[PDB]
Amino acid sequence: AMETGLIFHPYMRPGRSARQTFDWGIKSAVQADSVGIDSMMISEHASQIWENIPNPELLIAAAALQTKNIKFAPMAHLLPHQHPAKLATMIGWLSQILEGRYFLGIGAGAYPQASYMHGIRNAGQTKNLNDMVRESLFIMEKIWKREPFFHEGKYWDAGYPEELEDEQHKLADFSPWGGKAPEIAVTGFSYNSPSMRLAGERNFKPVSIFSGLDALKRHWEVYSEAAIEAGHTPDRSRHAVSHTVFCADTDKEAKRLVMEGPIGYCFERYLIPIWRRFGMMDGYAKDAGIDPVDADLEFLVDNVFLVGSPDTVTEKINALFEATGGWGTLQVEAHDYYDDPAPWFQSLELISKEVAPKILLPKR
Template identity: 35%
Template sequence: MELGYFSMPSHPPECGLKEGHDWDLQVLRWLDELDYQEAWIGEHHTAPWEPNPAPDLLIAQALLQTKKLRIGPGGFLLPYHHPAELANRVAMLDHLSEGRLNFGVAASGLPSDWTMFNVDGMSGQNRDMTREALEIILKLWTEPAPFTHKGKFWTVTKPDTMFDFLKPHLKPLQAPHPPIGVAGLSKNSDTLKLAGERGFIPMSLNLNPAYVSSHWDSVEVGAAKTGRKPSRRDWRLVREVFVADTDEEAWRLSAGDMMGRMMGEYFLPLLGHFGFKDYLKHTPEVSDSDVTVDYCARRNWIVGSPSTVAEKIETIYRDVGGFGVLCVFGFDYKHKPDAWRRSLELLQREVMPRLRHLGAELPKAA
């Protein structure tokens, strides 16, 4: 099992845009120093708690300030990008990364974003647009012959050579393209079925482990369509994690600090508006009103001393049937930077050595 990082990025609404950007950049430098495998950066347009409309700006800077860390959008919201433009931009970014780029894609789930871009998310149009956009992007990268794609949402032409020297020529450095990751939230997730179907990296967002265990079923359903055999080694689980020297200190710095504030002011109310609090419950009998910050911290988060955190991770691993990468859910601790870096360091240096035995039995994808 390896370690990664998933950043929305999350910042409190009073945080300046550059101030938040600089914090995210600092964390990415730490991740590289601490030998984390990868980091994923989200895209959102209308959420003051998730102020990052252009993840590639942060990624481009971070690539210059890191050496080993794989970095990628987690993900580009495909309904809001012209697929030909994004194909060219990602290809260029892959070259700048010297092959360290991951390409995360998502369908977008915020109604306020849908409204801004005139996308009918309630009918599933955002998911249809995501599939079509990704099909076009991959075709532009891999189809050598000229073509015209006339889709439901976009018409894109890859022209033949014009005036002897003008032609589409931008392709990613990684062949045939950077690793593609997709994030899933709901049960029977369409995006996780797509991951299984196409051999993409499946990512399960930070929900109750008992609920997340159903996500692998979606991956396998998709894989069956194309005769693939997916590997749990590729499965990423995003979790809230805080490690400190003692359980008491970890609790105070997580539920009693920015993790608790963000969950209480933003994430829990957001899931409540969608009717998604069931995703956080360990059993359906729990009432929505009981799904509080304290409930999530005790039931879902991975918080405590190194020994406590190692036990919790192994329990989740066994409960869901195994996974390949644990992605730490990012929070804004620029007011206590040493505590956040210490948590990341303890997770890598003291927790992970206790878990090296996990994953040895997981087969590779076929």
Template identity: 35%
Template structure:
């Protein structure tokens, strides 16, 4: 098992935009120093608790401030970008990263973002646009000959050489392209089917482990369409994690601090508006009113001493049938920076060595 990080990025609404980015960069530097494998930075446009509209602005700085960690958007919201422009921008970022870029893509799930960009998310238009945009981007990177792609949402031309010297010339450093990751939330997730279909990295967002187990089914359904055999080592699970020296201290710093505040003020109400609280329940008959911060912390979060966290992660691993990378869900702890750094350090140095026997490439019973 390996460790990574998934950041929306999350900041309380009173946090300044630069102040929030400075914290994110500090965290990325720590992750690099601690030997985390990767980190993913989200994109949102109308959520004060998820305030960053351009993950590549963080990434361009972070690549200069880190040495080995792989970084990527988690992900670019493809319905809101012209595919040709984004293809060039991502390719350039791959060169700036010196080949450390992961290319995360997503369909966008916030109705307020849909409204800003006039995308009909209720009909699934966002998912259709995501598939088409990604197809165009990959074609621009892989097809050397001139072409015109006429899609439902975009018409894109890769022109032939003009005036003897003007021609498309920007392609990624990593060939045929940077590793592509897609995140999924819902049951029968279309994006996770896409991951299986195209051999992309599947990422399951922070839900109840009993629910997340169904996500791998979506990956396998997609893989079956193209005759692929997906590998559970590629599967990323996003979890809320806080490790401290004792269970009591970890609980106080998580449910009793910024993790609890963000979940209580933003994430739980948001899921409630969508009717998505079922995704957090350990059983279908649990009333929505019972799905509180305390319930999520006890049932879904990975909080406690190194020994407790080790036991919880191993339990989740077996419940879902095995996965390859645990992605720590990012929170804004700049007011208690040492505690957040200590948590990341304990997870890497004391918990992970106890989990090395978990190999997602082995049969489930292993």
């Protein structure tokens, strides 16, 4: 029932080249596809070192004809940063190339440095990024329908022309596969996530970043309530939840490999300090009954990360399902194993083939 997914930020070690990063992305897509992973989400960042993909569509396109079954999604295209017509056209064309193995993450962008680059001062505090998202979506949906219009917006002018006065002289068809909008997704983190409400209101796919039991429950509560009120039927099998996940033959090996390898390195060098600064471990702290100040690597490995043998990880997931109601896709956060992929590819294969099929049905 539960699918396995990859989310590729990618947390490349500072100093990796663009070609190395791109090669690791393609290799990751091909391997994930080969072990039955259902989706690969690729994030977008123009200002960050570790999250060093500014154009997830380039990777998706390079992996498209090298894979069979896996579905790709930008997670997310930052709508305030591009002309909606240009973006809508690219999405539809890529969706066509993939024969529908595609869905669309949309976002405002959480990094003011990148907002600034794209002409939006004071994104942290004028232009409103959320209004820009709404206007872009309004324009893109119309372009995908291939119904003519011209729109003079607050943020952009855009349109879709009427045919001029042989099939070869009609307008190109860059509508997404099947001629309909792709499925749209949005991520959420905070406890009362406005993204989850938007998602529910518009029947988008919710993607939650695991921050603790209370938030995971609250996300679904907010989502479904918004869905119901908007007249949609909430479907928990749509819900994707992003986790650190690592599987090996034993609990001991699993833990050692995380502690001493790429995952532990990224967390100690980069993620733990950010998470500390921004209070992103308060949910985990609450769940385990500790002070956030004492949330270190080994705490996360023992209490938060889905780490261990296939049986252990299966248990941990099933325990979360009983506590929170569950989810449709386990979205595994990718790490920089480009130097020595074997233990990481073995983990993914275990998660996908041995863990995921044994998970309980999610709460309706």
